[PDB]
Amino acid sequence: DRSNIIAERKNKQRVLVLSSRGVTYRHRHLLNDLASMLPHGRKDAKFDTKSRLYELCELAELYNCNNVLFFEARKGKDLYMWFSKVPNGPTVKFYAQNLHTMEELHFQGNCLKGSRPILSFDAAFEQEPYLKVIKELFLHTFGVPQGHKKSKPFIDHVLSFSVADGKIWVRNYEIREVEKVKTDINLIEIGPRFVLTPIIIQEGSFGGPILYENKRFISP
Amino acid sequence: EDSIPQIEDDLQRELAFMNQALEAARLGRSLLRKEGVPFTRPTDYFAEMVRTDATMEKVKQKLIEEATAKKAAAEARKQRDLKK
């Protein structure tokens, strides 16, 4: 046994977070904030944009990771997300904006790194299928397997994914206990704030035939 | 989306996402005890935070500065209440 899962049925998941060659400190801090939360992931930096998309696959095969979260930077100003099942599974592309990182002293919330989250989804993540595919991809990227030996055990935070206009808004809150008056959970927000606008669904790993197209996207 | 009237209402938009993670947290807590795991961190688990400790030190200093400004301004009120 090599997958370090102590559970009745092992959820073998790994992610590989990556960066482009021109990200900003705001996009760099979202690597550090997301990877700190994400206990079964490896950090890597500065993928060559002159390479091809499917060289992100054997990069992840080199590190035994079935998920990849790529931060691609264009113009030195714009963050673009990529969630993908590495061998042959589907992928996604987002435009990320309205960034607010953990280093900014205005959130007043904190939690253990590596602790297991609760995934707080939205109602439209169930009824409409283009939200459903990214739902399973979000759930796998933040999978945090059961018997993972790098995970701290007590649960104190919940990740909230909600769609408002056409865009998904992420939220992170800390579970805190205040006793009821003759204990209820009060949420204090911890970490990353970003707004996630879908762009495409591709049926391949990083190419493959196009499945969803967001025909309302105003590019920067 | 039905909870949010206007997307520029920062107070209501924050409350809507907070309310969404509210019933997720209470429902998850109920199901987690029914199966049964250690859910709440005890007083003795000195475990490593997702944030740097010094970051909490400067955010504790900022909460000092905001709250001490409010009460010192109230002392300025009482001085000028004597003035009138």
């Binding site: 989804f121 109602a123 169930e126 | 429902l27 199901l31």
Partner: peptide, 15 residues
């Protein structure tokens, strides 16, 4: 009551 919540479908269903 004969109603519980399904986490994976987000609905209410009977026992």
């Amino acid at each position: 009551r004969n109603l519980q919540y399904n986490p994976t479908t987000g609905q209410w269903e009977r026992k």
